[PDB]
Amino acid sequence: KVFIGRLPIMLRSKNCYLSEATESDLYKLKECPFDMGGYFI
């Protein structure tokens, strides 16, 4: 396959774990359901 670098991911984009998260999934994850997410960490 081959590993090549790392790509910082924009919150709530298809790649992020929150995009498909339900409301409760967000609370258990300590992520405010009101967060919008067009940013990076």
Added chain:
Amino acid sequence: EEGPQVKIREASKDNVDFILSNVDLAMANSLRRVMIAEIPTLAIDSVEVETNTTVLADEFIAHRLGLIPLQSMDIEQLEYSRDCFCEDHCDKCSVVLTLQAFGESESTTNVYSKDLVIVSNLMGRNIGHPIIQDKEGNGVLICKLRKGQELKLTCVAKKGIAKEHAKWGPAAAIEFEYDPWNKLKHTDYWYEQDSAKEWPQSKNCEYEDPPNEGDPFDYKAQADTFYMNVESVGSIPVDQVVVRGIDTLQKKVASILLALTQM
């Protein structure tokens, strides 16, 4: 009984609609102010926190605790900690209460003032009992607990006055009016076309005689007949707010004659 004269209209455990007559506006007011700021009361004025896993901050909770009205019927039989000869607080000058709550059920657990428990010795004086007026004996909603969260506090009620902090205030609001028919001409009505048509006529216009069209301005009329209404918050019986209002005002002047004296 010659002098200021009360004439009650309504009365209940909360309000005392009345009509002061034959008095100086100055006295109606000083009394009006005293009720709002200098009637002694008991209120939480110190909170020791053992455990707070709640969603709120200690000082946040503590602040609310102080706002919870407490029984202040026999408040005079209690001394100000600053005068008391103990070291800090004692039964002679303070009421200790406790709050222990645990989120047991999975449903949100509420914490009310009823859940407060006196731990000091009230020595027979009706004092410190958290006031309750709601239709379910719950009292004020202090906090909310999720399952697993806890709240262990220790309060200390003390005697105080509104001037020091509005929590010690027995009054809620104080309606006050005079000359409902603008006869003394104390105010100058703002208008677009008609003074009369644009300004709502008040309650008390009924209890008085509308001036007559051609009467020349009565320049010697003063201000007597004041329409008040006192709303108590519960820490004390309405009738008391008034009565003690007159009392404290009375003691005030007294503290002055005694000043010229020992002067």
Added chain:
Amino acid sequence: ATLKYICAECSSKLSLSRTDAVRCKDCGHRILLKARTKRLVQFEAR
């Protein structure tokens, strides 16, 4: 029974010394919270 630290998630009261890195038991949360004090705080009710 004492507890110098807590875990960001499993709440399990951890507590270890040096050379112990920073992990909990099963909850490898390299986080950990410092646990409150016993020296009870007093608050002005104002």
Added chain:
Amino acid sequence: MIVPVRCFSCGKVVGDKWESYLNLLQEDELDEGTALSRLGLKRYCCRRMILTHVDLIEKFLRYNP
């Protein structure tokens, strides 16, 4: 966060009327104005206290720790 204990302006106790207000709306299908007047909140200073509150604690309680 939660129902303020009292009306900022006059002192009226209001922290003991939040649940009632909530019921007056749901189970009795009343309107906020009529609801508020029945709880005794007659002057607007006290009315705004309840009518404007936002119970964010009910969302805080949803976090695990």
